[PDB]
Amino acid sequence: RTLWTTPDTSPNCKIDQDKDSKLTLVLTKCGSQILANVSLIVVAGKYKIINNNTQPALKGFTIKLLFDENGVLMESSNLGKSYWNFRNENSIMSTAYEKAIGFMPNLVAYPKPTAGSKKYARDIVYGNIYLGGKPDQPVTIKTTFNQETGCEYSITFDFSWAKTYVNVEFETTSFTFSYIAQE
Amino acid sequence: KRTLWTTPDTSPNCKIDQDKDSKLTLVLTKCGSQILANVSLIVVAGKYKIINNNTQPALKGFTIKLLFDENGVLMESSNLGKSYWNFRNENSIMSTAYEKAIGFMPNLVAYPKPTAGSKKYARDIVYGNIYLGGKPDQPVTIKTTFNQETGCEYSITFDFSWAKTYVNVEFETTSFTFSYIAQE
Amino acid sequence: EDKRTLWTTPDTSPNCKIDQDKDSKLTLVLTKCGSQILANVSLIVVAGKYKIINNNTQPALKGFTIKLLFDENGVLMESSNLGKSYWNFRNENSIMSTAYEKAIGFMPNLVAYPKPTAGSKKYARDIVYGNIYLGGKPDQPVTIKTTFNQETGCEYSITFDFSWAKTYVNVEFETTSFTFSYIAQE
Amino acid sequence: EDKRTLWTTPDTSPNCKIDQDKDSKLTLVLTKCGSQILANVSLIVVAGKYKIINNNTQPALKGFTIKLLFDENGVLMESSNLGKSYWNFRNENSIMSTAYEKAIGFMPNLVAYPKPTAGSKKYARDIVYGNIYLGGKPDQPVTIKTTFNQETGCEYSITFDFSWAKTYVNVEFETTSFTFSYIAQE
Amino acid sequence: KRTLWTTPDTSPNCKIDQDKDSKLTLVLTKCGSQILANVSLIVVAGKYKIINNNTQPALKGFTIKLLFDENGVLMESSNLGKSYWNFRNENSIMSTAYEKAIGFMPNLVAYPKPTAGSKKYARDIVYGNIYLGGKPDQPVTIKTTFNQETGCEYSITFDFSWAKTYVNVEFETTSFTFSYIAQE
Amino acid sequence: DKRTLWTTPDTSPNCKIDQDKDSKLTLVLTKCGSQILANVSLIVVAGKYKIINNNTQPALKGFTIKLLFDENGVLMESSNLGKSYWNFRNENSIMSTAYEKAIGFMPNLVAYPKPTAGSKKYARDIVYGNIYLGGKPDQPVTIKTTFNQETGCEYSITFDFSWAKTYVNVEFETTSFTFSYIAQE
Amino acid sequence: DKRTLWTTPDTSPNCKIDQDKDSKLTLVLTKCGSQILANVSLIVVAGKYKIINNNTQPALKGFTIKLLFDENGVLMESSNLGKSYWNFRNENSIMSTAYEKAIGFMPNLVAYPKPTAGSKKYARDIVYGNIYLGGKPDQPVTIKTTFNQETGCEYSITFDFSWAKTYVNVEFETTSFTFSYIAQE
Amino acid sequence: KRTLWTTPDTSPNCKIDQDKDSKLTLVLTKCGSQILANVSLIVVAGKYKIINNNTQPALKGFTIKLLFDENGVLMESSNLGKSYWNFRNENSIMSTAYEKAIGFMPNLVAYPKPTKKYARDIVYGNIYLGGKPDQPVTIKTTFNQETGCEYSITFDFSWAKTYVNVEFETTSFTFSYIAQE
């Protein structure tokens, strides 16, 4: 009933370069809703340290999870496939999973955008998370369901900030949300 | 069934100011002693569809009320229409109206009905924000209150409000999740 | 008997010591959804120095802490601010009459949220921020910061740090509710 | 040395057991005015079952009793709810440096207020009723009923029965003061 | 001597709203560790003389304060006039103003001044009722509070209030007795 | 300068808040025809109000300075401000002889009537302002000025000083505030 | 009544800190009328407190040993100290019969009342001292002794050991400390 | 008896600044040639009750003196009140004032009166405010250094830290001294 990344600190995600980040994502199926819990540690590379004195235009970045028609994570995702599976103890199942359609965002609630059709905001959930656990260091985490092409379903995390942060490490508090499940 | 919902399509099901002027998308999923709730709103017509606080400076909020009888059945005075509200069946709703859903009602010990002279605590409220047009600089407050309406056994009230002066902004929102303690 | 919910009974009676015996009602409901605990919390201060906030007369009174400390079996330790007789598995609108022996399935996961270490980087993943509102008023926010497994002298812990920046003048400390979740130990 | 006042001292340090040890400060001052004792009383509950009244959760919790039992010399007996440590003749704002041995002139008169006895007519004149107010609020009355010489296992007694009719919700039990008098034994 | 009083005549001695609008009759008799107090009030002029809450709905109470210095001497800031307050001499007062009356002051351990970080207990209040015109259906609350005023070492504050709607009722009262713990 | 009544701008004490000469009220009244332009500040040099400690005295949160005038606008001895220090300007001092008339500086009695039983009391006779202890922006004090509300005089100006915040070892000496009022003639 | 209650002075473990019999508490209580003269030291023989390394275990900074007594002054089994060799002195061992009464050795309940909710307790019931690990003068630890603070007993003596310094591979075996306390009778 | 004491309840018995502002709990137990002494202090009122060295930076100590006559009887000039100091009787004091207690007095050969001053007539200790290990106060006890008496015990309390809103109520300290007889 839970798809997750093992919640240690080892990297599992490429924002800019391989293994530059640890996305901790836990999806628990509560029938018609998925209860989601997320946090991010950027361990290396371009996004490890936000410095808007030296890089004034660096105000955000994106992580995409793309899923096929069986709810299987696609290699085009920023999150690595070997890191994503049903929970087993404090680790993951040995064999890669074959179906997880019940964990996918519902396509009627959150349709793929279509040219010529009105796009509603119901497919977005906003939250904040806090860099370094400090209450004066918010960033926006914008989560969008089924926005991407090249997939049957998707979850997209857009992180952004308006403040000028100077040498602030990108490692965050946790946020919980939910979404309507496909089945 | 463990989920009561409005079918998550876009067809209007709610009256804010005029009949069928909005689509309230509300999903209540029973997790034992808590209901996990997910809500968003699309206004499709009427005075709240396009907010212009230069021409209508007083247009700063509105209310959507769900009132329930002793069996957890939606009452017709609610802003949400009854024919749209039922247990989930695939991506639609059961064909026959439900008779009991007390397990989805807000707990009356946690959230008592008002009585004169009774000390009223704020535990029966949850605050959140949702965002018009998906834009991060267009927040609206969604205040949810449990069991504060009269003429019903249980209630969920959504009060929407905003402080900013919105000019030519369509009222269709991002989603928000909350929970509340279940009656049984 | 509802072994999927640990809670304080959702009545209004006090169950918690912030400063003195029975000075507050922490309403806390932990509902196990497999590997995540769905948590719902509010606070009523019924007496003592935190009941009525006046920052004109007490400018330094800007926050306080409520700690839940648990042993290796998930049993609440007496050093916690919440009283042990008030904390148990649900039975209808009350609690089971005998004290529970095990609740590890409700504890915050130690790999996700490790105890303090001798020499390793401490990450912020073990914190959740929220706001709650005094008197239900939208202009009276308080920060509720929840931290997992950062207390010593226990095997697991949940710490609620309440704080505010505004100068509140004769404002009663009784709050709206907040929901969050955390990763479960098993 | 003021042998015309017997008191608890006027501090707020708990001296009384209603339900648990030292859960309350009974402030009681008995001043001898010849044939009458002028009495002044208030109560602060600091802990335990009666600190915070919540009649939504405990609708049957509507009163309690504090008994002072005295021997043939007017000495307070250990079976009393009030402790002996600081019940003594006045010395400034404290008590005399040794325990008193005789205070019959402070005892309620046995002809006016006889002890209960087998099949004898009990008259109400051994009672005085009053009200005191929780938290100083005029809408939070409680009844204080004082009865003289009705307890067993003593030669004299003063019994305070507290009761209320209203449904109090999270009201701290600490009271305004009340004055009464009674006829002295000698 | 053993009694501080206002002479029990009917000569106005007190300012509620305007000078000499009332006669407070107050007798404090020292009984060792307790002061036995007896009080009544006559309003002789001004807006509190005849109460009409149909036409003046906000006229629901007023305060008379006695403030004392470190020697127990009444301070000029009190509502009660100083020339009216002294030790008893027959049915009048001593001709020379008293210099010390600490034995008549409310005890500061029983009834402390406001203190930072100290809980304020209600035991520094005594409630009573007195009756307008001697009529049993015309109660007013007399609340007496010890040592809660600023600008003094000791204080006795009388707050009068009423919930009933009195219609053309003269404010002149029955008497009430209470006691309080003495400072020395 | 028959157009200015003032206390002079020096710092020698001229006022009794709690004890004699415990404070310097600096008050300048400049007649602009039908309006008096007023500028005020306060320095407490001694006594109970010199150093505020609301940890020691939590309930000490205000005090009053009254100026009472007779029917000729002459300051009465019952005022908190001393008469020696109050006169028309001459350079940075005051005139030698005490003034005899200053009705043109008195608060207008129609705008600001004396209170009387049975007459409505309007708030027009009050002006609120703030001043700041030690010049610090986070140490406000309210200065409430009321015209013609005192008894035993023909005209009055009352300054009620109050504060809400707990000040701990804060000297009571203030910034300045300007206001105006309607002149009797 | 010049008697002594003691643990015997050998080094056989008699006390649990973290695991059974991981320490020797050497405790000697000698009745000097109204005061008990007390002498204490501690040897940790096994377990996690035997060798302190606060670089690797920085949270290992203190521990507690409780002696709980019934209404007769008899040591209760719930104590950290075992009952077998806690008795009146006989030579370098203990009397052959287990004692039945030792109220004269109990901490006075008037001087040192049981704490109760809603009463702020006084510090009079504490004595602080230092003892030194390995006899080295730069290795202090605090021994805080509190009388009658525990529930589930009539009387109690609690030893709380704690240290501020970061000890690196230092064995927990201590010098001796003497104190006194007021006796119940 | 073998113990002179103050009843170890919380009732005040001592004037530091003002009458009845403090409870000195002092127990002197005769062990032959040595007196075993146990002391603590609770300030209940007045200027030393709450130390705030931000407001009162020079408030850094005070003294409590016990002066005795040739019979070891406490003199009224002492800070401790005579009503409170007597031989022990159960958990209180004897009701009749004692007449002789020379065996409890500090030895005059070990500790001579002012009229070569050696430091051996002093014992130093620390006690802790509120029982907190970071709130030490020095308690200096001096024998037979006051004038106008035959014997004396003087307690000088002092501290170096800047304490802010700290209540002066202490842990206990034990010492001994050589007895006069």
From TrEMBL, chains B, E:
Name one process (GO BP) from the record.
symbiont entry into host cell
Localization:
Host nucleus; Virion
Highest taxon of source: Viruses
Key word Protein transport present: no
Sorted alphabetically, the Gene Ontology cellular component annotations on this record are: host cell nucleus; viral capsid
Domain Adenoviral fibre protein knob positions:
1-184
**What name does UniProt use for this protein?**
Fiber
Q: Which organism is it from?
A: Human adenovirus 56
TrEMBL record, chains F, G:
Q: Which residues are the signal sequence here?
A: none
BP terms from Gene Ontology: cell adhesion; symbiont entry into host cell; virion attachment to host cell
Q: Which GO terms describe its cellular component?
A: host cell nucleus; viral capsid
Q: What is its main location?
A: host cell
The reply to whether Membrane figures as a keyword in the UniProt entry is no
Q: Where in the cell is it found?
A: Host nucleus; Virion
Q: Which domain of life is it from?
A: Viruses
Ranges for domain Adenoviral fibre protein knob come to 1-185
Family affiliation: Belongs to the adenoviridae fiber family.
Name of the protein in question: Fiber
Per the UniProt record, the source organism is: Human adenovirus 56
